[PDB]
Ligand binder design. Structure first.
Ligand code: NAP
Ligand code: FOL
Ligand code: MN
Ligand code: MN
Ligand code: MN
Length: 159
């Protein structure tokens, strides 16, 4: 099973200048809980944005060019990325925009955080078709001293 996880600001913005400009510790905690002990697939730009391997997860990087770091696994196509995960129950695709576009048709589940923040961005989460997806979990949180925007955790499953 393939799942996508992402945090979206208004208008599906997910990044700007190879960064995420907001800071929502509660959402990073949600990301860690839902990805720990699973393989994570990311594109090369997202690997450079994170800047280090994510501990406790098999890190698989898509790039058309040879890898430059043997602490992670480098693959050259979507099919190779999936194969490198082996026989696991759930593969987590962690972006960025180009990678999400390619894995969306193959995904059964989306873990989305909707952030009430207006962000100029240059990268968006794919338009998906709402009729294809059932919301099975949602949890709203107001802003607090640690998290400066309200946010909504949602899990959707392909109907
Ligand atoms: N809010 C969130 O949840 C979230 C999550 C992840 C990322 N982001 C943001 O998203 C942005 C980066 O996204 P992006 O769309 O620019 O880049 P990306 O999807 O992270 O990476 C694209 C790169 O991955 C490689 N790639 C993708 N598909 C491939 C394929 N089928 N075969 C081989 N290589 C493939 C290519 O690398 P080569 O050029 O080396 O071939 C391509 O240039 C940043 O702003 C980051 O902060 C946000
Ligand atoms: N909901 C969501 N939020 C994100 O921030 C996110 N980020 C990415 C890609 N970028 C990043 C950037 C930093 C870390 C990171 O530092 N993660 C630590 C945080 C642990 C914690 O804060 O409790 C980790 O071990 O996962 C992960 C992914 C992909 N999907 C996402 N999905
Ligand atoms: Mn092929
Ligand atoms: Mn197999
Ligand atoms: Mn806000």
């Amino acid at each position: 099973m393939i799942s996508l996880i992402a945090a979206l600001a208004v208008d599906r913005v997910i990044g700007m200048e190879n960064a995420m400009p907001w800071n929502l510790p509660a959402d990073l905690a949600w990301f860690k809980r839902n990805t720990l002990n699973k393989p994570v697939i990311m594109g090369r730009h997202t690997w450079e944005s994170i800047g280090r391997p994510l501990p406790g997860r098999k890190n698989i990087i898509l790039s058309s060019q040879p890898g430059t770091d043997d602490r992670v696994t480098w693959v050259k196509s979507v099919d190779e990325a999936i194969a490198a995960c082996g026989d696991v129950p759930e593969i987590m695709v962690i972006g960025g925009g180009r990678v999400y576009e390619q894995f969306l048709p193959k995904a059964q589940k989306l873990y989305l955080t909707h952030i009430d923040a207006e962000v100029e961005g240059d990268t968006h989460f794919p338009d998906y078709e709402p009729d294809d997806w059932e919301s099975v979990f949602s949890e709203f949180h107001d802003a607090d001293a640690q998290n400066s925007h309200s946010y909504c955790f949602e899990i959707l499953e392909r109907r």
